């Protein structure tokens, strides 16, 4: 009705007075800061840390835990809910990690939401402005539809690689970061499909079906080793850190950065394609955002761990060597795509220099952080062998 | 000193562990500890309140020693005892699939953990084992889960009934 | 050249095709079931659109919290008892939300159909949101409320008390340790469908009645996401129904999940609502029956009958063991008040009438005990009395269920009074019901959780409280209190003078 | 204090009791819809209309006004605050206009804010990803810093042309749209300077100062006719509708759309420059946004006015012809810029195709609406006469 | 490869050079001053940062309104008198926000320096936001309040009454008609600095006291933008301070602007606060003195001293006329209640005591009159009495100042009672003060606004109301009312039966 039937303690005269009467003269404690006991990474504790750190109920037998005792219910066999046994890496405290962008759920979906609505505005402006007229037909129907489209399966696979980590991560801060790295990958896979669906609306005859790109990924040659690597990283790795590390600090840093930045982002412009770079801008923004987190966890926290620094670097060095070979193969196969381009699009020198940019950025941003002795010319020469 | 997170038992073991500076000695001590203090088949419950913590400290030492002693391939494919991890995993899954009953199955799964839990077996193979062994064990255990009466189940488990109030 | 774009359904139409075939494309977790390769999902979301819909909800929520509610001093104008109840409700639910994150990541790994993985994925992200939302409630009451202690450090002060253990069983380990399908039943088919969905709403009601407008604002927002999780739980059953294993194990795992959830929430939710509030909304007795019996055990569950799902075989025992459960439990929680991170109160005169009115016989049992304890000076710091002593003096030992972690005193209880004590390989075990007992007997290695008496044995009370930081910022006064008034707060010294030393009750058996 | 000293009627027992006792049993009118008397442009009245329509206090002597009488205070001389005498155009109702995007302040700043935050994120990814490495130094230090930067003054000039209209508009709906069209223009201009400021930060010898691009705009040959038309649309026009119509449906639709879309947007990519297209995507998203508003006002409302249809069209055709010449002139001069491009960048076959796109787009979106009959060949011909 | 970006300040650094020189680069509006084109703005903003900071404020506000405030039914639990008052405050302020757009648009055109134009432009957008915010307030009270009529159609129902004319003088025409600098003085230097900035805050105060949490949510957010405009107003003076024309014209334009603004707000605001509420915050006399004499007339005007700005010479005169101004006006507003778009109420016992306590002499004059009207049945339909009849009976003319449009009655007023009548080329004019009189004598042509008696002359009252839609949804009941209760509402017929026909009071001098 008018006032409704339910009476509320905050506004109901009779109830509020009862409540007000029972209240103390002042707060029963002056420390009004939730998470006051958490060690601040920066000057002052952030909202990100307070709302996140120690949310995971780990006992002290899992580095950094504040609880005590065994789990209340374990798996048949005895496997604990969470345990040190789910990863080779060791640390003094699994809660030391901090996403440098301090992303908790609200800030995360806020930014992605902004990106979504602006993406919608961009496409409506792009279509209404008829910019599709100046795009090379071959680049559009052959390279975007088939090859860029096939790449969605690569990103999809890398997304799935995070499934076990979402379950096994040994701390809240690592779990949130991990979940967001994976969610950004599924988002890119979907944006690749979104572009294909948009083109199908503005270009008569363009088929948005994933059949062609999927066949390219599952049975083609250009992406064969890429697919073999993704399949391994995803389903053959049972260690959540080996997965997150090898994916972001090895495979995606070399293959992913080469394909997105040195191939599509670099050449689409040459064929009058400003559409694909719009989406690749998002993918690259996300890549750099994830890198900051990846670096803080594996290098600042684990690779520089006061007690396990040497150990962790030996393990990561091991994982780097294990995953660098399949990654090189993935790049080597992809070189086959350069032979498909119209003559004069690019040459061996441009292709070589671009390989070196990816390899040099990788050595600087990752390899060097654990003292992995990477030989840049040896890696590039191994890849160039794939040039037909 | 009798604390929850810090006490004499824990300090004592930290010292014993600091004196393990060989992979073989350290790995052997971790497995022994697991046989002596973990699972419902542990040889004793004397360390019930600290074994979880002490075990993690022992694992740390074994991991560190193994990474220094092993080359890269062995670190990925050998157990801390020098066995081939894949053979062990397959050999154990083979036994699990031949398990006649749930009682034989629980012994295989539990024992596998006590002997090969990570710093011993590489995690990749170990969690692949958890995946396979855990599946069979459950399939055997959850079949006609309520048919056996508690009176008879207590006997099969072999507990000593101390007190019944109803 | 018309303005055109692409939405979520248009892309989702092809999501199912995203997954591809390869030899090792299979779940990494042990399971008795096989999830259908072509299972679909109810809602057609993509990362981008999911973010937008959740972002819109956040703006409203944080807007109300930062603007109007803050201007109304809504953080303060709440009954003292409810401010305390929210320390437990928000922090305990927080952990359920959190473990649901790992739980749905495990289900995401289990599903083979891309659409079913995507369904679980959306929940993975929602449970992170919910974890942060529950954290925000405690964060807000600590920053603006009448008593920040507990709200500000529950993540560590919750480890002192026994109620926390049972919470980790139903909402932590119960969500992620076991067959993925068993976990799905604990989380979605039972947990959320039976308890959390109606619970979240019921908390907003109890909250509004007691002056709290902060919780309704956040919890009502949490509720808008639950529809999707319901569908995931339902979809889990569909995906595995046409598999032979299903007929063999589904109802057994469902029965176990039902008993697990019920065992803890039946007595705990009722206790927090009736004893942790000033103004009452509804007697738990009827709330429970409508919840568990009518809505879930009847409507919902029968809908899943076409997939082989049957009503839990332990449903009857749950109902019989439910009537006095929460009353039996508050006696223990209050008697062990120094082990908590919140302040408790004895029922006031008006409340005892309500209790007796709604639960005939309440006064003759609990009523009198509470009157005796206040006569003994349980509220007064100089009395040198703690209700626990009364339990000792009258030979009423308190045990801890080895499986569920729920505290029980069979000699002094009006509900279940069963007790089974077993010895196995040098260790004693105490069980309070025939269902958990079967669980332990069949799965010994799954239940080795040490109880507080085992861990605290031989320890003097004040020492445990000091070690686990159970103090307010002055470093003298206890966070926990036997009353909710603003004066005469017990200090660590008041407890030490008591010279209370823990002992494991099971060691008395030979 | 904890409770504070100020008692609030909503929560104070005593005060709220008094309030509650004075309340009627039910609302005193069931018509709870504000703006219920406004004629809905769509199915149901929208929030955009409710909060905007009739905010302006015009009397009936200004077509559409609902008030009565003269203004309370006028200018020295007698000129009314608002009056029919400030524009040649006539109508049956000045409140008929509707922004197809239905933008009131809130949605407007929400969209621009998301764009600002994503912009910041993009530049952070771009810099971190080192994408500047693949950009042509000449195109940068010289076609972006000088010729793109100079175009900023063109957009700034069009921004100011809106000032008088922000004062003389005869209705809220027309005033709100006008303000937004201009605000978006100043935004574009500030984004141009933003890019140069960004380049300055990542390109060690790049000078952000507006000196170079300004002198090019104030004393160059490339934009001389460009600057001449702007200074005229801005300071020589005293009619708000002529200014708005001539700027958005004549000048910037031809000169503006060619420069932004057919030159920098079409050629920047060819120099490994995806940075500039990022900002041009905004200007174009903005252009097409403003476009639906311009069309609804001058064509849907006025051009098709139930009583002044013919009259208004005559004036707009007149306006189209008046400014079509200075616009065509601004283009010709711009053609001289192609000669400064490195050999092989583009050929007359391409520029001819792009010009026909701009002209044909203009004829399709504006020209044919008011029936001026423009000849695409003659226009393209007269413009093309500015290349050697 | 550092993550890098560019903020507002870094782009704004080069904004001043955005404008370039050319023959016709000058203001399109007549003015006696010259704004220096080197003038700078205080805030270094660009379109995008501006949008972001405003968008964040929108979040909080709309979030509070749509969520918590609606759940608390904030739109209903407001005192009736205040619900009515907000129909006037929000809508009348809306027009000021709206004309301020055109005004700052004109000032944007007036400024030559790019930075000064940018400052004004930022205000153009703010005033658009404020227009929409004030609109939203009426929209929300219409949608969720106890009486939507008036809130729902003030944009047309406000044309019926006399109070609206004077509002247009200070907040519509005063803002845009005349020298750009005169307008800037009316809007920013006087209107905003002396009245609106304090007013908006005070409104949130009175609103809260009367149960209204909606207005505070919206108005406090508007308030956050007011700093930018104060600065704009201040920078206007600095821009013309070095022009010799300034020493010759500024102080006269300011004094006229001062008198213009206080002439309306002094009566009106004090009336709406004290008579449009139940719960009181502070006596208007105290408020007025603080705002006008101390804060503005003293502190604010003083900082402009170094620029040749002196206190308005009409200051003392304003203070003598103020004391009883608001009290005198409510008698006319209530007497003419049928011409409003809101419901009015006579003071209750507690209020009359409050008025006497704060205004000695109040009861013997206003108090006795109100009780005389009520006993005679001014609140009852069936009485056939409307206070306007009492004014006619006791021969107390009501005139409309030709300049300010403010209603005044010489013969009855306790405050100013001067009256000047003049004939010029066949038309009569009535003035209430010496300042407005000079304004008209000097600029005839700027002040030809027709008053309500002139336009309604000879018309029967009910016909003017029906014609202008002064009716509620049922087509018979009047929007306006002489009481705030839910029963015995006056209808178009109750007014018609009165046979009230309007007459031009100036014709009595004929
Ligand atoms: Ca070459
Ligand atoms: Ca014994
Ligand atoms: Ca005077
Ligand atoms: Fe949840
Ligand atoms: Fe959920
Ligand atoms: Fe304003
Ligand atoms: Fe303002």
From Swiss-Prot, chains A, D:
- Any idea of its EC number? 1.14.13.25
Q: Which CDD domains match?
A: AAMH_B
Disulfides per UniProt: none
Q: Return the broad EC class.
A: oxidoreductase
Record's keyword terms, sorted: Monooxygenase, NADP, One-carbon metabolism, Oxidoreductase
Origin species, per record, is Methylococcus capsulatus (strain ATCC 33009 / NCIMB 11132 / Bath)
Q: What is this protein called?
A: Methane monooxygenase component A beta chain
Subunit description: M.capsulatus has two forms of methane monooxygenase, a soluble and a membrane-bound type. The soluble type consists of four components (A to D): protein A, comprising three chains, in an alpha-2, beta-2, gamma-2 configuration, is a nonheme iron protein containing an unusual mu-hydroxo bridge structure at its active site and interacts with both oxygen and methane.
Curated annotation (Swiss-Prot), chain B:
- What are this entry's molecular-function GO terms? methane monooxygenase [NAD(P)H] activity
Swiss-Prot/TrEMBL GO biological process terms: methane metabolic process; one-carbon metabolic process
Q: Which organism is it from?
A: Methylococcus capsulatus (strain ATCC 33009 / NCIMB 11132 / Bath)
Which Gene3D superfamilies does this chain map to?
Methane monooxygenase, gamma chain, domain 1, Methane monooxygenase, gamma chain, domain 2
- What's its EC? 1.14.13.25
List, alphabetically, the InterPro entries matched. Answer: Me_mOase_g, Me_mOase_g_dom1, Me_mOase_g_dom2, Me_mOase_sf_g, MethMoxGammaMmoZ
Q: Does the keyword Ribonucleoprotein apply?
A: no
Q: Does the keyword NADP apply?
A: yes
What this protein is called in its record is Methane monooxygenase component A gamma chain
Catalysis: reaction(s): methane + NADH + O2 + H(+) = methanol + NAD(+) + H2O; methane + NADPH + O2 + H(+) = methanol + NADP(+) + H2O
UniProt keywords, alphabetically: Monooxygenase, NADP, One-carbon metabolism, Oxidoreductase
Q: What does this protein do?
A: Responsible for the initial oxygenation of methane to methanol in methanotrophs. It also catalyzes the monohydroxylation of a variety of unactivated alkenes, alicyclic, aromatic and heterocyclic compounds.
Q: Which SUPFAM superfamilies match?
A: Methane monooxygenase hydrolase, gamma subunit
Subunit:
M.capsulatus has two forms of methane monooxygenase, a soluble and a membrane-bound type. The soluble type consists of four components (A to D): protein A, comprising three chains, in an alpha-2, beta-2, gamma-2 configuration, is a nonheme iron protein containing an unusual mu-hydroxo bridge structure at its active site and interacts with both oxygen and methane.
Swiss-Prot record, chains C, E:
- Give the record's GO biological process terms: one-carbon metabolic process
A single Gene Ontology MF term assigned here is: metal ion binding
Q: Which reaction does it catalyse?
A: methane + NADH + O2 + H(+) = methanol + NAD(+) + H2O; methane + NADPH + O2 + H(+) = methanol + NADP(+) + H2O
Which UniProt keywords are present, listed alphabetically?
Iron, Metal-binding, Monooxygenase, NADP, One-carbon metabolism, Oxidoreductase
Disulfide bridge partners, by residue number: none
| Binding-site positions, Fe cation 2 | 192, 226, 229
Q: Which residues bind Fe cation 1?
A: 97, 127, 130
**InterPro entries reported for this sequence:** Ferritin-like_SF (IPR009078), Phenol_Hydrox (IPR003430), RNR-like (IPR012348)
List, from the UniProt record, the residues annotated as the active site of this protein: 134
So which cofactors does this thing need? Fe cation
What does this protein's record comment on cofactor binding?
A: Binds 2 iron ions.
Q: What is its EC number?
A: 1.14.13.25
Q: Which CDD domains match?
A: AAMH_A
Q: How does it assemble?
A: M.capsulatus has two forms of methane monooxygenase, a soluble and a membrane-bound type. The soluble type consists of four components (A to D): protein A, comprising three chains, in an alpha-2, beta-2, gamma-2 configuration, is a nonheme iron protein containing an unusual mu-hydroxo bridge structure at its active site and interacts with both oxygen and methane.
To which protein family does this belong?
A: Belongs to the TmoA/XamoA family.
Stated role: Responsible for the initial oxygenation of methane to methanol in methanotrophs. It also catalyzes the monohydroxylation of a variety of unactivated alkenes, alicyclic, aromatic and heterocyclic compounds.
Name this protein carries in UniProt = Methane monooxygenase component A alpha chain
The source organism is Methylococcus capsulatus (strain ATCC 33009 / NCIMB 11132 / Bath)
Question: Species lineage, top-down?
Answer: Bacteria, Pseudomonadati, Pseudomonadota, Gammaproteobacteria, Methylococcales
Gene encoding this chain?
mmoX
């Amino acid at each position: 009705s008018m006032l409704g039937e339910r009476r509320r303690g905050l506004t109901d005269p009779e109830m509020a007075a009862v409540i007000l009467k029972a209240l103390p003269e002042a707060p029963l404690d002056g420390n009004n800061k939730m998470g006051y006991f958490v060690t601040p990474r920066w000057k002052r504790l952030t909202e990100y840390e307070a709302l996140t750190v120690y949310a995971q109920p780990n006992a002290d037998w899992i580095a950094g835990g504040l609880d005590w005792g065994d789990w209340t219910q374990k798996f048949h066999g005895g496997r604990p809910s969470w345990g040190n046994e789910t990863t080779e890496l060791r640390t003094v405290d699994w809660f030391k990690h901090r996403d440098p962008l301090r992303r908790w759920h609200a800030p995360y979906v806020k930014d992605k939401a902004e990106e979504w609505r602006y993406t919608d505005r961009f496409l409506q402006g792009y279509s209404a402005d008829g910019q599709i007229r100046a795009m090379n037909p071959t680049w559009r129907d052959e390279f975007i539809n088939r090859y860029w489209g096939a790449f969605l399966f690569n990103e999809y696979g890398l997304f799935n690689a995070h499934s076990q980590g979402a379950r096994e991560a040994l701390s809240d801060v690592t779990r949130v970061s991990l979940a967001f790295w994976g969610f950004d990958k599924i988002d890119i896979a979907q944006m690749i499909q979104l572009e294909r669906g948009f083109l199908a609306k503005i270009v008569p005859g363009f088929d948005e079906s994933t059949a062609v790109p999927k066949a390219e990924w599952t049975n083609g040659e250009v992406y064969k080793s890429a697919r073999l690597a993704v399949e391994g990283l995803w389903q053959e790795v049972f260690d959540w850190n080996e997965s997150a590390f090898s994916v972001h600090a090895v495979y995606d840093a070399l293959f992913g950065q080469f394909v997105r930045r040195e191939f599509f982002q670099r050449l689409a412009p040459r064929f009058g394609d400003n559409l694909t770079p719009f989406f690749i801008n998002q993918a690259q923004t996300y890549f750099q955002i994830a890198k900051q987190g990846v670096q803080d966890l594996y290098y600042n926290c684990l690779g520089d761990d006061p007690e396990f620094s040497d150990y962790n670097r030996t393990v990561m060095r091991n994982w780097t060597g294990k995953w660098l070979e399949p990654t090189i193969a993935a790049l080597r196969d992809f070189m086959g795509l350069f032979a498909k381009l119209p003559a004069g699009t690019t040459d061996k020198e441009e292709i070589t220099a671009s390989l070196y940019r990816v390899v040099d950025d990788w050595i600087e941003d990752y390899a060097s952080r654990i003292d992995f002795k990477a030989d840049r010319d040896q890696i590039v020469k191994a890849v160039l062998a794939g040039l037909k | 000193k009798l604390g929850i997170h810090s006490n004499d038992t824990r300090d004592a073991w930290v010292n014993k562990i600091a004196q393990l500076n060989t992979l073989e000695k350290a790995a052997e001590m971790l497995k022994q500890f697991r046989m002596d203090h973990t699972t419902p088949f542990r040889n004793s419950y004397e360390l019930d309140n600290d074994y979880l913590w002490i075990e993690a400290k022992l694992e740390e030492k074994v991991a560190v020693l193994k990474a220094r002693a092993f080359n890269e391939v062995d670190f990925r494919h050998k157990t801390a005892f020098g066995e081939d991890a894949k053979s062990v995993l397959d050999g154990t899954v083979a036994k699990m699939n031949a398990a006649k009953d749930k009682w034989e199955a629980e012994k295989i799964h539990i024992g596998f953990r006590q002997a090969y839990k990570p710093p011993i077996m590489p995690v990749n193979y170990f969690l692949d084992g958890e995946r396979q062994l855990g599946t069979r064990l459950m399939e055997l255990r959850n079949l006609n889960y309520y048919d056996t009466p508690l009176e008879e189940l207590r006997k099969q488990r072999g507990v000593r009934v101390v007190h019944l109030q109803s | 050249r018309a303005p055109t774009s692409v939405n979520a359904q248009e892309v989702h139409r092809w999501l199912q095709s995203f997954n591809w075939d390869f030899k090792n494309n299979r779940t990494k977790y042990a399971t008795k079931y096989k999830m259908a390769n072509e299972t679909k999902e109810q809602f057609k979301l993509i990362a981008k659109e999911y973010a937008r819909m959740e972002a819109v909800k956040d703006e409203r929520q944080f807007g109300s919290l930062q603007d109007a509610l803050t201007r109304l001093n809504a953080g303060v104008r709440v009954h003292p008892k409810w401010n305390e109840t929210m320390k437990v409700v928000s922090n305990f639910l927080e952990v359920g939300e959190y473990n649901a994150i790992a739980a749905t990541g495990m289900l995401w790994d289990s599903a083979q159909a891309a659409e079913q993985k995507n369904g679980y994925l959306a929940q993975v992200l929602d449970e992170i949101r919910h974890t942060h939302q529950c954290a925000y409630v405690n964060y807000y009451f600590a920053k603006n409320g009448q008593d920040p202690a507990g709200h500000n450090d529950a993540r560590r002060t919750r480890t002192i008390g026994p109620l926390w253990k049972g919470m980790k069983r139903v909402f932590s380990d119960g969500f992620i340790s076991g067959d993925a399908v068993e976990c799905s039943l604990n989380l979605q088919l039972v947990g959320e469908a039976c308890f959390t969905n109606p619970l979240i709403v019921a908390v907003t009601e109890w909250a509004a009645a007691n002056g709290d407008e902060i919780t309704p604002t956040v919890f009502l927002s949490i509720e808008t996401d639950e529809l999707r999780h319901m569908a995931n739980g339902y979809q889990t059953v569909v995906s595995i129904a046409n598999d032979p294993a299903s007929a063999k194990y589904l109802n057994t795992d469902l029965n176990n999940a039902f008993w697990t959830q019920q065992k803890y929430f039946t007595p705990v939710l009722g206790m927090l609502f009736e004893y942790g509030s000033k103004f009452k909304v509804e007697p738990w007795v009827k709330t429970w029956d409508r919840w568990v019996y009518e809505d879930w055990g009847g409507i919902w569950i029968g809908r899943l009958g076409k997939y082989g799902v049957e009503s839990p075989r332990s449903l009857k025992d749950a109902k019989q063991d439910a009537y006095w459960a929460h009353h039996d439990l508050y006696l223990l929680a209050y008697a062990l008040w120094p082990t908590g991170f919140f302040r408790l109160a004895l029922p006031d005169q008006e409340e005892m009438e309500w209790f007796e009115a709604n639960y005939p016989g309440w006064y003759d049992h609990y009523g009198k005990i509470y009157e005796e304890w206040r006569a003994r000076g349980c509220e007064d710091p100089s009395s040198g009395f703690i209700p626990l002593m009364w339990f000792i003096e009258n030979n009423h030992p308190i045990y801890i269920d080895r499986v569920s972690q729920v505290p029980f005193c069979p000699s002094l209880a009006k509900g279940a009074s069963t007790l089974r004590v077993h010895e196995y390989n040098g260790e004693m075990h105490t069980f309070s019901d025939q269902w958990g007992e079967r669980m332990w007997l069949a799965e010994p290695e799954r239940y080795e959780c040490q109880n507080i008496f085992e861990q605290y044995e031989g320890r003097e009370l004040s020492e445990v409280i000091a070690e686990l930081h159970g103090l307010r910022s002055d470093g003298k006064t206890l966070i926990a209190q036997p009353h909710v008034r603003g004066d005469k707060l017990w200090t660590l010294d008041d407890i030490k003078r008591l010279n209370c030393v823990f002992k494991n009750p099971v060691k008395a058996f030979n």
